[PDB]
Amino acid sequence: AIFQSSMTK
Amino acid sequence: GSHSMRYFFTSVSRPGRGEPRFIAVGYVDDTQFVRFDSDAASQRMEPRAPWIEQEGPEYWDQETRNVKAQSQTDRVDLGTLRGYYNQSEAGSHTIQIMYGCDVGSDWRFLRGYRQDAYDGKDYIALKEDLRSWTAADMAAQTTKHKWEAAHEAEQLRAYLEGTCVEWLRRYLENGKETLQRTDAPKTHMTHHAVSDHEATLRCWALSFYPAEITLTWQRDGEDQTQDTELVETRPAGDGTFQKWVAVVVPSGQEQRYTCHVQHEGLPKPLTLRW
Amino acid sequence: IQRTPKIQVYSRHPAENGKSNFLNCYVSGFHPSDIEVDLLKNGERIEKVEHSDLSFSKDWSFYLLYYTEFTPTEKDEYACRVNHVTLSQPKIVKWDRDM
């Protein structure tokens, strides 16, 4: 399952 | 043996019209098992390996929702990074992301990693300790300060050390018939006359898994690299891989040369001689 | 920021005439990702050609595998045509059954 909390750059 | 789960994301801006092209692929070791293509009609995360089709509709709903959210984040990042680098809105640009985790021979967490790139160059990368970021330039420095100051900064580490490992173990057990099976290389040697005085010996390794392999030529028991050729490992298309290495030898001296093959599927390295 | 594609044209199985096989064109080490790849039978583009999903290597360069089912004969000649921003003209690499 993929990561679901990537933050915008 | 060691095992890995990695995800690859690519977003390519589309000036002229429309949203960026977004392609995501998931791998367990060298086996692709999921994909997402913004240009595909389903607009769903799709299976690319039989053993992931066992997962129910809740898994596919969750993966589709989260991969769409990732795509939106990358689209926002494409616009932000265009502003960071003082680039015009007329050109196309690309963001690439790879993250994953490795479990060791003890089936416990071994490593986690994440790397982000802009236009084919390093942008920001997670450190080995998973506690801070490495920024390639000043725009990435801005991103680094923002991320490290955020309340939710810990989430990625918690994913890599925990959730990522648990899913990898689940996938390895569900697909163990193939994922935990090593396919030893099928090896053979060919001989081609190049001139009246020289010949080419080509050492073939075919239909092996995983992709990692070492093919080496030896002359009279000593490693030789001169007058050799070594093609990049290539996929067969059926999930296995191919490679070959060649050496030019004087005619009649072929017996001096040995091809040595190292692979996970071989209890001892193979030695081929003409 | 621009790397030209390396190209390999090869069969999945050892080539024998009259025996069904798979023709592969493996393009790797290129950037940006936009590329055009065709498989040619005697200069004619093969319509039923599939390709893998876009991925990239450690150096951020992309790689793709294009493939088609085919039955090699002694007269039919096969090749792979690749166009990329780094190429002034389309690059055609002929299939060598020994490589």
Author numbering:
A (entry chain C): 1 to 9
B (entry chain A): 1 to 274
C (entry chain B): 1 to 99
Please give the exact wording used by the authors of the publication that reports this structure.
The class I proteins of the Major Histocompatibility Complex (MHC-I) present epitopic peptide antigens on the cell surface, thereby enabling immune surveillance of the intracellular proteome by CD8+ T cells and Natural Killer cells (1–5). The heavy chain is comprised of three domains, the α1 and α2 helices define the peptide binding groove in the MHC-I structure, while α3 stabilizes the molecule by creating an extensive binding interface with β2m. We developed a method called ‘CHaMeleon’, to generate synthetic molecules that combine the peptide binding specificity of one allele (template or groove allele) with the TCR binding surface of another (base allele). X-ray crystallography demonstrates that chimeric molecules bridging divergent HLA alleles can bind selected peptide antigens in a specified backbone conformation.
We identified and substituted 9 and 14 residues from HLA-A*11:01 and C*07:02 within the A*02:01 groove to generate the HLA-A*11:01-A*02:01 and C*07:02-A*02:01 chimeras, respectively. To experimentally validate the designed chimeric HLAs, we refolded HLA-A*11:01-A*02:01 and C*07:02-A02:01 with the HLA-A*11:01-specific HIV-1 RT and HLA-C*07:02-specific RYR peptides, respectively. In both cases we were able to purify recombinant pMHC-I complexes by SEC and further DSF analysis revealed melting temperatures characteristic of properly conformed peptide-bound molecules (Tm=51.8°C for A*11:01-A*02:01/HIV-1 RT and 49.8°C for C*07:02-A*02:01/RYR). The best crystal diffracted to a 2.02 Å resolution and had clear electron density for the HIV-1 RT peptide, which we modeled in the F0-Fc electron density map. Overlay of the HIV-1 RT peptide from the wild-type HLA-A*11:01 versus the chimeric pMHC-I complex, revealed that both peptides adopted an identical backbone conformation with a deviation of 0.543 Å in RMSD values. Additionally, we observed that while the B-pocket was occupied by Ile2 which was principally stabilized through hydrogen bonds with the peptide main chain, the F-pocket was occupied by Lys9 projecting directly into the HLA groove. The observed accommodation of Lys9 into the F-pocket was the result of two salt bridge interactions between the Lys side chain and the introduced HLA-A*11:01 groove-specific residues Asp74 and Asp116. These residues appeared to orient and stabilize the Lys9 side chain within the groove, while the main chain was further stabilized by hydrogen bonds with the HLA-A*11:01-specific Asp74 and A*02:01-specific Tyr84, Thr143, Lys146, and Trp147. Interestingly, the introduced mutations Gln70 and Arg114 were responsible for forming multiple hydrogen bonds with Ser6 of the peptide within the C/D-pocket. Taken together, our HLA-A*11:01-A*02:01 structure revealed that the newly introduced peptide antigen adopted an identical conformation to that seen in the wild-type, parental HLA-A*11:01 structure, further validating our fixed-backbone design approach.
